[PDB]
């Protein structure tokens, strides 16, 4: 048998065909990725091993992440049909659904109260 | 200021500048699809949990298994080791 | 081999705890002693019926002596 | 009531004429004394409210809030000492005066007998809060946050002003006592519906309601620690107090008009707690938790059952204390790391043990661990809603689950895990910070012993 | 650990698979004698294609073996107790306190261990004295476009310490307790 | 000198005087609202011998 | 773009000048007095004395009075065979029902 | 009767003295763990006195010492219901905790915060005692949540270990899912019977509708790790072995079953609830035991055994046999804790080796713990005339001789064989066989604390069943006449399980490597439940929270609907009004238009 | 001390001990030890404190409120009479709540005391609580958080109108 990857169960590198590509362009790309990683690591180590430095080493990636998660949300937002539809169906949809459910339950209880069918023998605290 | 996430890259020049900003290769860099959801030019990093990352590699942040300056996943908080795990399973 | 154990400074938190306990007890201990003494000696009151032609004071409708003092003096 | 108001006023000349080395000391001393004096008001009568004079009165609803404000002022001063230590003497005195003015205004709001006087003072609270947020904020979003807060509150309040004047013209008096004794039922006419909306919307804005809560995250995050303390401890409860007062003349129309707001709040608690789950900012997480806890109170007020009102009062007091404490802890961490990102600082339990214990206790109170007054209020509201409709238990229990989840998540992310290596400026906790946390926690745990005091006038 | 590489050679990948396969087989074969018997049989299978020269053929074989490894993967393989995923992994991590906290100790606390802190000051001086040369040495040995690998150079000349050494040298002990 | 003490710590009496004055102001308002001293249908009683008022 | 002072360095730890700091201000004596004031008034007074004050606060909620009156009423109701609680909060005699 | 009340209160009060003294120097000194242990021992000795009085007469009382608050017609007062269940369970729990504390003193000797550890153990003990001695639903809920939180703290004892933090959070999550049902039950009882005290609740409720009992069932499943909410207990092995041995083996896990037992008069009235409990317990027994069969971690096997036992107790509840379930609770607390302590001893001797595959030849290396494990496993499998025989065997007999769902009964009997199977697993693969542990043998159990604690639990496991069963008053009518095969079924199934498990273990010796079966993958992956049910829901919830709620509504549409729109409208209007043209001709023409329009409109 | 009429406690029936085994009952010895070492010193301390109290013997009285005209006998806008009547109504509300509490205490005590025979030996207590519950619920229920004497009057009037309609049918 074989392993079928999913969104919550990714395909391991051992079973990943791309891992076994030994073409020159892929090797150069891996070298470039390592170069970027090494540069960033070197900068962080230089700041981190500096005896004079007494403080938090600011991480630009973290700042960008926090900004994009909150600050940049609206500026990039466009009123697309998808966004409008999803926003409506998850904003007012649940509200209307819960309203319907609760209203029906309340009206049923009130009907039982009106005809006296509802039992309230010791329901003296409300 | 220019080191802050911007709008969806339209020209290839914008894409290259965004790739440089996030310290990613231009080839690797991929913005989220311009669906109007406010993602912007933030990189669409692979949706893999931090647990999948090599536990033997020396990370700048060991508990989070991350390096300083490395682009951070949009849903990192969801993909922390303490939360949803996308690691491969035997079956 | 006794090896030095790197720890966070513990003097400051311990000092805070010491100061907190000292200041709390500075008045708690006298207050607790006073409460015990009053309850032991002075004691509470008996629910006697209102004597004829007498108007009990507002503090005369409470039982515990400390409560009576509080009502009489502060209210 | 002047036994509390006059000393509060006398704080201002003292602070202005105090020596630069004694400003904080004098302010803290006499604020604590004023809180001690305010403690006398807790001796509420069984039925009649403490009508001190024609203008000022107190009941078992107003007295806990008054004590809360008078107690909150000193802690705000203590918290503000740290960041406002490089400020010039005049500006430091200005900050202290803003806090004192806010406390005085709140006292008068909670004691005002006339509805229009309450409106005047409760909208007067905006000015000090706005000044505090915009002037002594640390970020650049402080201006926009202040604008949002001010405009939300005013857009809610102005129709309330019109409605209150209309009531004065029709009924003849806005005194709470007369308004309650001469209560007349409202019909279902559109005019009455819009009057009800005008009378409810302002307080709905004051205590963040899902949909109108957008101002709260900005305000709490951008504002300085003291400003956030008042914002999340008293200023939100202003809405609840006003709504509970004004619902006296809004019946039986409340039965028909509650459903929209009731459903909004019942879904909003879940939504906001889920938002807390996926937050990256500590202060924002605290603010959204506040939103959910206040939505609980909104539901309680709308239902209008006695148990609901008792639970609402208890929850208001408990949340005030807990939210103020949480903001103070986040402020200490922020001062040490100069960032509000939650994932930035990790494993602080190893470096700062006692502050970690404070974090643990605060988070336990946030998740309503029995028998904390938080749980007392939450459970009372849950029972009242269950009486209203059995289906409510689903959302209520889910909200409890999410609250526990995000509170423990905050504790784990901040006060657990591997310590951040590069952060080397985490010094030992100051005595002032620990004292602040203690003065936040100990009163609450003591209040659990005698909940009757904070159970409201319907006890 | 050791400096990472840009990629793994086909030889390296097979060796990695070999260790994983034996460990999973050991997990399957609880008894030692049973494992040793099948270990040689599995080793022979690797030996059979040790002569295999065609890289395309060798790569094709590697793919098949990994697929076989996944199908025969032990669902609950044995992991060393202190290894990642082990029961005792990160168990003592909380007890590990960074050394810079010692500088925050109250003078009374530093008086409790005078000799240690005195020696600690010597270490502090050593770091500051060598730091300038460390950065300078890195620049001299840094390629034009910065470092392409994370590997760091040693102390070329006497009297200098390996650049970026403080944290590695002064790292917390495995069991602080 | 005690003079130097009061010279620098005079502001420490403002708020206590505030409380005293407030107690007086509250007492004043109560005096103005003594319109039903013994006219309530619940607490109406005859003044005891040598009692000027019930202070109610 | 502007001649401005460089960002102020990380706030000087009050421990640096004086190891015994307690936070608050910088002057050690005023720090001691501020900590004494906060602890004495904050813990010894309000937290203790006021807690005792509210603990022995005289019962004006009429709880004990309510219980005692209920006891008397129960005695009378049972002695006279009257129902312990009636079915009308007000007498129907004085209610001029339309 | 007067000493009964005095002693019953004093046990709980004495338990609180160490917590108070945690503010003194004793906490800082190294005597604190010993002081804690001695306090617990003295409290157990005191608890024996009310037990003796109850055995002699049957004295049961309720003590409402302090009145908390009177909410209109509902009065809340701290009330300790000292009855058979509480008066008997307090001694058992205290004795088990005493042994566990001695074992912790040995096992956690090197722990830097051993004093904190002992204080936390006492705190959990106090919370469990409050839960047991609770006459108000509020007091029981206090015990409930206190137990949950103390478990949260103890499981996450190693903060550095991320897995520990995740396990603690997961435990809180599942327990809170149960707490939803607990709160529902509280609300229902308050609204319908106007009471939170067990007395009035029992008196008024004589039909006990489904809703409150269903909520109680949900809470019990939450605390007793029943199916659906089971994974928290196996994951709770992340904490120290004493913690798992005390809380998640004998006190915390039985809380749900105790909750159901306490409401037995109400549960008997309803019928659907009984069937639901029966079916649920059967599912838990089968699934947990099946998973335990293929677990390579000794603590994991023991934890799954605990879950199976709790499911058996739930089935007993389904047979409407509450007292039998309580007796099983006691016996399980006696022997399972000893099993966990033996596992901890093995782990300590083998230097943190929890994988049975790397444990071998321990039969002779550790004779005392070997004997203890043998006796405990035999009792767990219901060896005749042991603690297991006097509860489990009766439970199986009752299940067979009752109007019961057929498949539930079948699942119970199959689970019984699986019980012997996992016992054979933890015997053969650990104590028996050739050594597989690493070299440098450091095996040493010659520690007075460990020996004494395990010895106490041994004496309990051997004789307590007889003593307790022969002392407690008869409360269940026995099934005297029974088919012989049904009578011996428990032993027959146990023997079958033992034989088959040993056969498979022998075949493991055979040099025949074979690839895993799909069934083995299912069992070893815990039925895949902790994989799909811990990834899909969490992913959906967190993704929805971040996108739909956080951004889509809050940061996008809500802001677009009110503030953004209004501000944009104001901006456009400002631009229109401030045309910035400033030409007399234009605004004078506008004046003319205004004059004409006014003259026409207002005439 | 308390009124046994208000709090009925059936006369205790303790069986006489009749040991049939030579073995000495541990409970007896333990009770003797407990009495001697605990009850005796506790009683002595109680006696000393009681002497101290007897020396400082003072009395506290019970305030009694006269009846005030009800809201039924009150003018439309007569705020003085309305205040008097509302305070009276609230006092009566509290008294009724306490009566309910007393009956509930009776019920709970019966449930515990009668043990397994609680169902058959607490019929009177259950009936009493049912009566009180019915009365209290009819008088005070659904009034709302802002309850008032006027609200109870309105509810009673509505009930009386419904009763009239039912009797007319």
UniProtKB/Swiss-Prot annotation, chain D:
Q: In the Enzyme Commission scheme, what number(s) does this protein have? A: 7.1.1.2
Matches recorded under InterPro entries? NADH4_N, NADH_Q_OxRdtase_chainM/4, NADH_UbQ_OxRdtase, ND/Mrp_TM
Q: Tell me, what is an example of a GO biological process annotation in this record?
A: mitochondrial respiratory chain complex I assembly
Listed A to Z, the keywords are:
Electron transport, Membrane, Mitochondrion, Mitochondrion inner membrane, NAD, Respiratory chain, Translocase, Transmembrane, Transmembrane helix, Transport, Ubiquinone
According to the UniProt record, one GO cellular component term is: mitochondrial inner membrane
Source superkingdom: Eukaryota
Which of the seven top EC classes does this enzyme belong to? translocase
One GO term in the molecular function aspect is: NADH dehydrogenase (ubiquinone) activity
Per UniProt, subcellular location reads as: Mitochondrion inner membrane
The UniProt entry lists membrane topology as: Multi-pass membrane protein
Name the reaction it catalyses.
a ubiquinone + NADH + 5 H(+)(in) = a ubiquinol + NAD(+) + 4 H(+)(out)
Q: How does it assemble?
A: Core subunit of respiratory chain NADH dehydrogenase (Complex I) which is composed of 45 different subunits.
What does this protein do, in the record's words? Core subunit of the mitochondrial membrane respiratory chain NADH dehydrogenase (Complex I) which catalyzes electron transfer from NADH through the respiratory chain, using ubiquinone as an electron acceptor. Essential for the catalytic activity and assembly of complex I.
Which protein family is named in the record?
Belongs to the complex I subunit 4 family.
What's the protein name?
A: NADH-ubiquinone oxidoreductase chain 4
Which species does the entry assign this protein to? Sus scrofa
Swiss-Prot record, chain H:
One BP term from GO: mitochondrial respiratory chain complex I assembly
* Top-rank taxon, per record: Eukaryota
Please tell me whether the keyword Translocase is annotated for this protein. Answer: yes
Listed under GO cellular component are:
mitochondrial inner membrane; respiratory chain complex I
Query: Which enzyme class, named as a word?
Result: translocase
Give me the reactions it catalyses.
a ubiquinone + NADH + 5 H(+)(in) = a ubiquinol + NAD(+) + 4 H(+)(out)
A Gene Ontology molecular function term of the record: NADH dehydrogenase (ubiquinone) activity
Signal peptide limits: none
Q: What's a Pfam family this protein contains?
A: NADH5_C
Q: Where in the cell is it found?
A: Mitochondrion inner membrane
- EC nos: 7.1.1.2
Topological relation to the membrane, as annotated: Multi-pass membrane protein
What InterPro entries does the entry give?
NADH_DH_su5_C, NADHpl_OxRdtase_5_subgr, ND/Mrp_TM, NU5C-like, Proton_antipo_N
Which keywords are on file for this protein?
Electron transport, Membrane, Mitochondrion, Mitochondrion inner membrane, NAD, Respiratory chain, Translocase, Transmembrane, Transmembrane helix, Transport, Ubiquinone
Q: Does the keyword NAD apply?
A: yes
Per the UniProt record, which residue ranges are transmembrane?
1-21, 43-63, 87-107, 112-132, 137-157, 171-191, 213-233, 241-261, 273-293, 301-321, 324-344, 366-386, 407-429, 457-477, 482-502, 582-602
- Record note on quaternary structure: Core subunit of respiratory chain NADH dehydrogenase (Complex I) which is composed of 45 different subunits.
Its annotated function is as follows: Core subunit of the mitochondrial membrane respiratory chain NADH dehydrogenase (Complex I) which catalyzes electron transfer from NADH through the respiratory chain, using ubiquinone as an electron acceptor. Essential for the catalytic activity and assembly of complex I.
Family to which the UniProt record says this protein belongs: Belongs to the complex I subunit 5 family.
Q: What is this protein called?
A: NADH-ubiquinone oxidoreductase chain 5
Organism per entry: Sus scrofa (Pig)
Question: Gene encoding this chain?
Answer: MT-ND5
